Amino acid sequence: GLFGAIAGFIEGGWTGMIDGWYGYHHQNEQGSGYAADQKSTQNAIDGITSKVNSVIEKMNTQFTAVGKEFNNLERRIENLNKKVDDGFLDVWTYNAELLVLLENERTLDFHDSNVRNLYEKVKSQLRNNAKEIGNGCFEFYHKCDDECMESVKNGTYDYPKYSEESKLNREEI
Amino acid sequence: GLFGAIAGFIEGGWTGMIDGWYGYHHQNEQGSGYAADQKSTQNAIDGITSKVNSVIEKMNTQFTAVGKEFNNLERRIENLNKKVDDGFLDVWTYNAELLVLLENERTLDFHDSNVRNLYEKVKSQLRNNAKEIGNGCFEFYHKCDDECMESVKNGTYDYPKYSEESKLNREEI
Amino acid sequence: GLFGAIAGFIEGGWTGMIDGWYGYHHQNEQGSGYAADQKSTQNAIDGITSKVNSVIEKMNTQFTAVGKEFNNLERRIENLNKKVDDGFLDVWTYNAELLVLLENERTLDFHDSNVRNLYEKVKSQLRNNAKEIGNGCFEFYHKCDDECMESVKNGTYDYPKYSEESKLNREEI
Amino acid sequence: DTICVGYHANNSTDTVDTVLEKNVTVTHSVNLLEDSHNGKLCSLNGIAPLQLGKCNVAGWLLGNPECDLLLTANSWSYIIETSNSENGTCYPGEFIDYEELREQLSSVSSFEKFEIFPKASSWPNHETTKGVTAACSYSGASSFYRNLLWITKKGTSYPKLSKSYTNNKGKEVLVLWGVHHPPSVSEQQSLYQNADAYVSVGSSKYNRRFAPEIAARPKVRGQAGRMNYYWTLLDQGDTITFEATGNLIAPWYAFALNKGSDSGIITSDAPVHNCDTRCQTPHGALNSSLPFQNVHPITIGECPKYVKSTKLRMATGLRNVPS
Amino acid sequence: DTICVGYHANNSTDTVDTVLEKNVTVTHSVNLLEDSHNGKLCSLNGIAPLQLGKCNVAGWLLGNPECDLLLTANSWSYIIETSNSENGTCYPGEFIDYEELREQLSSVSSFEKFEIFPKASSWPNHETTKGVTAACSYSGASSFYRNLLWITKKGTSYPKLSKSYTNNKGKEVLVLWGVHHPPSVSEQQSLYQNADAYVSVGSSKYNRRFAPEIAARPKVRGQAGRMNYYWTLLDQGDTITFEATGNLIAPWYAFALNKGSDSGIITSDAPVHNCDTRCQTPHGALNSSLPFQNVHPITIGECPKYVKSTKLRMATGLRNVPS
Amino acid sequence: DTICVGYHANNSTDTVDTVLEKNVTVTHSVNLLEDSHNGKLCSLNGIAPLQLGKCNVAGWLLGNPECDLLLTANSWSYIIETSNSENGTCYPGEFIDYEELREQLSSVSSFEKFEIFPKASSWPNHETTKGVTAACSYSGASSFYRNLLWITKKGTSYPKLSKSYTNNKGKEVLVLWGVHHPPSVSEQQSLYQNADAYVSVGSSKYNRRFAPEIAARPKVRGQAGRMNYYWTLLDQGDTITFEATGNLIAPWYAFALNKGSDSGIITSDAPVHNCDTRCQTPHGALNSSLPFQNVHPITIGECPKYVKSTKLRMATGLRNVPS
Ligand SMILES: *[C@@H]1O[C@H](CO)[C@@H](O[C@@H]2O[C@H](CO)[C@@H](O[C@@H]3O[C@H](CO[C@H]4O[C@H](CO)[C@@H](O)[C@H](O)[C@@H]4O)[C@@H](O)[C@H](O[C@H]4O[C@H](CO)[C@@H](O)[C@H](O)[C@@H]4O)[C@@H]3O)[C@H](O)[C@H]2NC(C)=O)[C@H](O)[C@H]1NC(C)=O
Ligand SMILES: *[C@@H]1O[C@H](CO)[C@@H](O[C@@H]2O[C@H](CO)[C@@H](O[C@@H]3O[C@H](CO[C@H]4O[C@H](CO)[C@@H](O)[C@H](O)[C@@H]4O)[C@@H](O)[C@H](O[C@H]4O[C@H](CO)[C@@H](O)[C@H](O)[C@@H]4O)[C@@H]3O)[C@H](O)[C@H]2NC(C)=O)[C@H](O)[C@H]1NC(C)=O
């Protein structure tokens, strides 16, 4: 279930970003961006942690398994013992490899879903401004400082404060 | 694969809704809403029913398993028997727990996908009217009775009937 | 995880399309469409091929399994042998059936995701033109030949070439 | 006017464990694991089970005189031993191949107990009523088993013994016997008056020549001698021959068998009632349809399958998010 | 002008079962389970299998004179028994450790049958040609086995018998012998003229002292006596010694062994042809590459894996939705 | 001004295999499989293991005089055999039920070796110091075992032998003995002066009457006779009785047992050091917490679980896509 975000419409990754997994890059009048989003990455860390711990928990630990001995008139019992051991070994190696493959699929799809959800969350609160272009970028018809940037990073935007000026600018373009 | 609908942009659930799993809430001139959608919930009920029945079907029922007896010169056979029983018990308990966990993941994602699909289905037939806001709500530029409500609930809207009046209203706003 | 494309907003399939799995249908001044998209179908073929080969690879091949013989004073060993064989047979048939069911779910969701991603990829490069309608169809405000068709099929559109004429046409409508 | 879209909420409290989160609250769910059982042992499919009581399987088949009450039992579903069952072999010794006999008994559904060798007619040479030990005592008196027969001399004489029996019942016949050996040569000569002796058993696929062994050994239940026990299945047809010198514990009752599998030797001491089920454990009975089971791994019937977990709640519904 | 986007449709009818729905119609799919087999028994990797015909394994090794046609067979891939194979031990008795010998034969690929004790030279004291039973009859006449040798007296005399054999072939040698015992003491004295007798076999890790047992028993195939059979593997080096009084069935042919595993004693009666495969069942042969198999669980070769299902169609493609 | 949204990139190179693609490069991952082990055999939970050295288990219990150095060992965690351990039974024969004794030894944690029958006091009729073979040689001289005792005549006389022993130690006692038989009747009469002889062992649940067998056989280690060995567990209470004519290898040391499970007879030859672990293999020791293991399938302790793969890297993070 490729959600289309990672290596999709968003082209590549960020080396300069250090702190979290998912963040922003603001480019107003002063300074540049590369600020993480510590709210959506914490849920991801908790989910992956509880995933790995559960995978460790569902497996057990074997106790003392020591080989037995048979003479030359108990061949049937020896072949039966060898069959039992080989069977259980094959069953467990199959379970382990299959579990690892499916878990890797689901965790990559999980990160993809997180990025798409964060993009939709930004677009939902920026209603008709900012004219989204290219690899997940906006434009901001109205001009605003670092305060509106931090506002968008919080999840509160108070859209009727910046409505009419952005409307006039969108119309005059 | 969190689709972003349940506990996402749609905030909470409805206690007052009784009949189905997925429905609407209409707020025109007379009365209030809380009407279910008996078309999309029936497919969900059939899917979950055929899921649970399949999970019951793939397991079998054990027949008479009675313990055996050994004397004090057949210790090897007794240890072999105990090993076989413990091995099979561990394999089956692993299979059961792992199946339950993965099935729970997939059914929650299934309900999430259903809600997002229903939202997209409404938005697709309401083309440029109604100015979608907040937690999956519309506005209806044109004023219409319970008949247009029931029309939207059916899946037919005849958009060119209400086009020009809504266009005039959208322009005069 | 039904993505809503196959038997969703896109209603049915195409019989006339021959070459690939996912394609287009262009309806300009000369000729009709039914041209495949050889870039997105190749990744699908490679994914499904590496899926089937992996499923074949994770299973093994049994060697010589020949039945044993016991007299009328070794009933316990015979019952133990029968128990071991029946147990392993049940474990493997369970694994096989369960693997096939889950793999079928995931491959159908994979094709659904591919179709939705291709639709989004077209819509992303057709910014404000073409007024998308119905089961994944566009309109092209500006009139263009087979060259713009082949351009859209490549993934390059040079939107500022056709901007102002389409803007004038959209306004005069 | 709005057509706000939303999902269903409920006031349920049943939680479901998933991979990425624990204790998720789901609106509707379904159980898949059994816990409850009535602490009773009912009859599986109408036929009542045979409770041995204070009796071992060997004690029941040899006819230990403490185990008299189940003298006339010939039909069961499964055999119950208790934790107090200790009256096996009263005279001390060894029941050879006792476990194989239990595995043969785990497939037989009924009996027909009959006379092979009638006590008053078949032995007109030896004494048949003056030989009995005091270790197997019964109400003060000294009684032997109820299915075997001790053989003594008749007035300082012991003729060579030979007796055969053919099979004419269509079913398989389970034959038991014993071989006694005393601790001293004086006891050997006092009971049998043969320095060397043997017994020999032959049918077609069983053939053995038993000789006694005489050695001093410490006493169990106040007896210094020993006794070994043996069993053989016949077929419809072939005949058995006993040929003895001075050492035979002759059979006196047989058992005709009947097939019909899926029996057991469940060991528990929960009481017996007369309901009807399709699944039976040593802890109790089970009545359900869920695919998993948690009571006990040793089952008789068509029982649900045993795992070793405590919770298998499976979610069928939405995440309960009250607004 | 439009650039309508759509997916592929087809007119296929192959259905695929998934979790949420049954019988889904998919455009392209792939099979993963085998059903077909040619009802023949071909030769695995060039070497033809050895068909016993109306012969048991014991009958083949002892050299039962009905089993004459396979007198010169010394190479196989796997051994075939039919449902009509009943000519095992002609003279009645018991082949001791018959199943362990089959498990040893399931690892040997060829033979070299040779004389241990030459019949005309090694026995210049006893008679070697006047002792033969009529139960093992052959075309009216009375013949014994083809690999063993009966021993009788030579004119009211029986010297003490002792004979040894060393191993100088590098391979393991499989040695068979027998011990006869009559039903009566009169027959014992008439054949052997020894009230007590023994045989004794010793090498380094095998050592036993056999004594006969004499008892009356009902006859099988019109013979009241019995005979027991025995087998021993030697090594490169160590020597075997036979030492007998009046009870020896002397060996007359051995078998040098050769390793090379993965053999079997498949029991079927489908006919034998001369194609070449890599997988063999009792029902037939298999030629495939799919990971699952449904024909039969008992296989010889590098066979695909056995499950107990009827359909494992795996979907590689879209949902076929014709518009 | 823009609020471009993006994900994290890194310069890691660790690849992760998934279903639809191989060798995917992931930013962060975690290992789940063990490879590393120190090639040493440390002491499990403080208690040092007992290394047999050039000694077999039978050689250690019988007291083979080459195995003198471990004469005073009475505590272990697990028993180590090497690939050079060959000094088992010095005098040639057969240790009957040698594998069951190993399975009993796999549950015992300590010993108390003591005198049952004191050599200087318990035998005032026979000779106790003039009977010793030369096959079990030690520094040129001829010595017997260190736990058993040969019995010879005392001047052309052999009284009937009988001796008993009671148990008063609360623990189980492991008793060994032997039965010798010569190749010739002349050697039998020269050592014992009894044409017929027996030994007999009886406690309560063990009872056997051994008779010698005399037959010529090829010699091993320059000895044509044979010797059989036997072992029996007693209980707190019941007494054992030996009663012999001319064939007894009398016990001279016992072993009081102590429970405490999870021991083993690991066979390796990696050196022994004195660290402390919780998991031990024949290849080495393991110190980890990962759920899967790849070193060796035969383990002692609380070890991680054995599979047969080479890579189980599990992805916890994003696809590393450098721009
Ligand atoms: C079926 O199995 C039941 C038990 O489930 C048997 O009944 C038991 O029989 C045993 C053996 O007879 C009894 O144990 C012994 O009892 C002897 C006499 O009884 C009295 O004395 C003892 C202790 O001195 C008391 O416990 C008991 O209450 C009585 O007051 C004792 O003498 C035995 O002890 C010792 O002495 C003898 C003789 O010197 C020695 O051989 C022993 O080694 C030991 O040192 C011993 O305690 C047991 O008590 C009985 N139990 C019951 C419930 O009564 C049935 O007899 C058996 N059925 C058949 C067919 O016999
Ligand atoms: C290899 O195995 C085959 C079978 O696979 C053997 O051939 C069979 O040999 C048995 C034993 O000899 C035969 O069974 C018996 O046949 C006797 C005589 O044959 C005639 O009579 C019977 C019935 O009266 C007919 O079925 C048959 O067609 C003949 O007309 C019978 O006398 C036997 O019956 C009874 O009498 C005897 C003597 O009193 C008793 O001992 C028996 O208990 C029984 O009451 C019995 O029916 C069998 O028929 C043969 N089958 C075939 C196919 O010919 C081979 O001989 C054996 N190979 C070797 C090495 O011997």
Ligand SMILES: *[C@@H]1O[C@H](CO)[C@@H](O[C@@H]2O[C@H](CO)[C@@H](O[C@@H]3O[C@H](CO[C@H]4O[C@H](CO)[C@@H](O)[C@H](O)[C@@H]4O)[C@@H](O)[C@H](O[C@H]4O[C@H](CO)[C@@H](O)[C@H](O)[C@@H]4O)[C@@H]3O)[C@H](O)[C@H]2NC(C)=O)[C@H](O)[C@H]1NC(C)=O
């Ligand atoms: C513990 O186990 C060790 C081995 O792990 C034993 O030591 C070995 O003892 C065996 C048996 O004595 C030895 O093998 C034999 O050695 C005999 C004499 O030694 C010399 O000659 C041989 C070869 O001729 C050389 O290999 C060796 O280096 C010496 O120079 C040989 O005579 C034997 O060969 C043959 O002759 C005899 C007599 O005719 C025949 O019985 C045999 O069948 C054979 O044909 C044989 O080679 C072995 O060499 C010893 N090994 C070591 C390491 O010294 C311990 O003795 C045993 N512990 C106890 C309790 O005894």
Ligand SMILES: *[C@@H]1O[C@H](CO)[C@@H](O[C@@H]2O[C@H](CO)[C@@H](O[C@@H]3O[C@H](CO)[C@@H](O)[C@H](O)[C@@H]3O)[C@H](O)[C@H]2NC(C)=O)[C@H](O)[C@H]1NC(C)=O
């Ligand atoms: C989420 O985002 C908003 C948007 O930035 C945060 O609100 C801002 O918080 C600062 C903190 O001081 C406020 O500054 C205040 O300024 C006045 C003078 O104007 C001064 O008297 C106060 O002492 C304080 O310094 C700022 O006004 C406020 N937002 C604006 C610009 O209106 C908010 O904190 C973030 N967290 C929350 C609560 O969601």
Ligand SMILES: *[C@@H]1O[C@H](CO)[C@@H](O[C@@H]2O[C@H](CO)[C@@H](O[C@@H]3O[C@H](CO)[C@@H](O)[C@H](O)[C@@H]3O)[C@H](O)[C@H]2NC(C)=O)[C@H](O)[C@H]1NC(C)=O
């Ligand atoms: C799906 O939704 C539509 C929209 O409501 C349903 O159509 C409506 O059905 C009613 C049923 O009576 C129609 O009423 C009719 O009114 C006329 C008088 O105007 C009368 O002569 C008829 O006897 C009937 O009462 C109504 O007109 C019609 N829709 C409108 C308002 O145009 C429809 O039934 C739903 N189901 C289907 C078929 O999709």
Ligand SMILES: *[C@@H]1O[C@H](CO)[C@@H](O[C@@H]2O[C@H](CO)[C@@H](O[C@@H]3O[C@H](CO)[C@@H](O)[C@H](O)[C@@H]3O)[C@H](O)[C@H]2NC(C)=O)[C@H](O)[C@H]1NC(C)=O
């Ligand atoms: C992806 O799509 C574009 C859009 O069609 C392809 O570009 C077109 O390629 C043709 C190939 O000849 C160009 O034609 C050229 O015409 C001039 C005369 O105008 C002539 O001198 C050249 O020899 C050649 O015939 C065409 O101009 C060009 N696109 C346009 C219309 O600007 C492109 O090839 C596709 N592949 C790539 C590289 O992405």
Ligand SMILES: *[C@@H]1O[C@H](CO[C@@H]2O[C@@H](C)[C@@H](O)[C@@H](O)[C@@H]2O)[C@@H](O[C@@H]2O[C@H](CO)[C@@H](O)[C@H](O)[C@H]2NC(C)=O)[C@H](O)[C@H]1NC(C)=O
């Ligand atoms: C998950 O919940 C179980 C049970 O707790 C119930 O469900 C919780 C979500 C919450 O609603 C509780 O009030 C409910 O009682 C927890 O298991 C128990 O945890 C408590 C500590 O809270 C402990 O004292 C009990 O012994 C535990 N019982 C058993 C049998 O495990 C469990 O810890 C929760 N897991 C989490 C939150 O990680």
Ligand SMILES: *[C@@H]1O[C@H](CO[C@@H]2O[C@@H](C)[C@@H](O)[C@@H](O)[C@@H]2O)[C@@H](O[C@@H]2O[C@H](CO)[C@@H](O)[C@H](O)[C@H]2NC(C)=O)[C@H](O)[C@H]1NC(C)=O
């Ligand atoms: C699923 O289909 C199988 C086979 O039926 C075929 O596929 C169906 C979708 C439809 O196209 C049928 O016309 C095809 O024949 C069904 O299995 C058979 O069902 C019929 C009753 O319809 C019964 O008589 C047969 O005995 C069944 N055969 C076997 C071997 O099962 C199956 O019932 C369908 N499952 C559903 C629809 O739930």
Ligand SMILES: *[C@@H]1O[C@H](CO[C@@H]2O[C@@H](C)[C@@H](O)[C@@H](O)[C@@H]2O)[C@@H](O[C@@H]2O[C@H](CO)[C@@H](O)[C@H](O)[C@H]2NC(C)=O)[C@H](O)[C@H]1NC(C)=O
């Ligand atoms: C997947 O990779 C492994 C290892 O190769 C590494 O990872 C690759 C993606 C690439 O970065 C290589 O440069 C790295 O070395 C491959 O396994 C090895 O493949 C080579 C041939 O390239 C072969 O010579 C080695 O013997 C292989 N080693 C082992 C132990 O398998 C593997 O082939 C790659 N699988 C693919 C690409 O399908």
Ligand SMILES: *[C@@H]1O[C@H](CO)[C@@H](O[C@@H]2O[C@H](CO)[C@@H](O)[C@H](O)[C@H]2NC(C)=O)[C@H](O)[C@H]1NC(C)=O
């Ligand atoms: C939560 O609300 C539900 C509503 O169904 C309660 O269910 C009903 O509660 C009423 C109270 O009078 C009972 O009479 C009904 O029997 C209940 N079910 C019905 C409709 O038959 C539910 O009990 C409430 N919560 C709890 C604690 O269960």
Ligand SMILES: *[C@@H]1O[C@H](CO)[C@@H](O[C@@H]2O[C@H](CO)[C@@H](O)[C@H](O)[C@H]2NC(C)=O)[C@H](O)[C@H]1NC(C)=O
């Ligand atoms: C076993 O369980 C069933 C229910 O699973 C019990 O039968 C029910 O009895 C009640 C009261 O008579 C009825 O209302 C239900 O209709 C019954 N259910 C069914 C499916 O029969 C039954 O009593 C329990 N005991 C036995 C032996 O059946």
Ligand SMILES: *[C@@H]1O[C@H](CO)[C@@H](O[C@@H]2O[C@H](CO)[C@@H](O)[C@H](O)[C@H]2NC(C)=O)[C@H](O)[C@H]1NC(C)=O
């Ligand atoms: C459904 O249509 C397909 C189209 O490929 C049919 O396949 C071809 O049908 C023609 C009819 O003349 C045959 O000549 C071809 O051999 C078929 N395959 C090809 C192209 O080689 C298909 O047969 C039709 N449906 C069925 C029932 O299979």
Ligand SMILES: *[C@@H]1O[C@H](CO)[C@@H](O[C@@H]2O[C@H](CO)[C@@H](O)[C@H](O)[C@H]2NC(C)=O)[C@H](O)[C@H]1NC(C)=O
């Ligand atoms: C076994 O199956 C293979 C096919 O899997 C058969 O070989 C094919 O024979 C046909 C006709 O000669 C050829 O067109 C194919 O190229 C062959 N395929 C392969 C892969 O060889 C074969 O005949 C069957 N029998 C044996 C014993 O191989």
Ligand SMILES: *[C@@H]1O[C@H](CO)[C@@H](O[C@@H]2O[C@H](CO)[C@@H](O)[C@H](O)[C@H]2NC(C)=O)[C@H](O)[C@H]1NC(C)=O
């Ligand atoms: C890739 O870049 C990372 C950045 O973390 C390197 O990690 C650090 O590299 C510096 C170079 O001076 C070391 O001093 C640090 O110790 C490394 N980690 C830290 C921050 O402690 C990383 O080494 C680079 N790639 C490789 C080949 O590992």
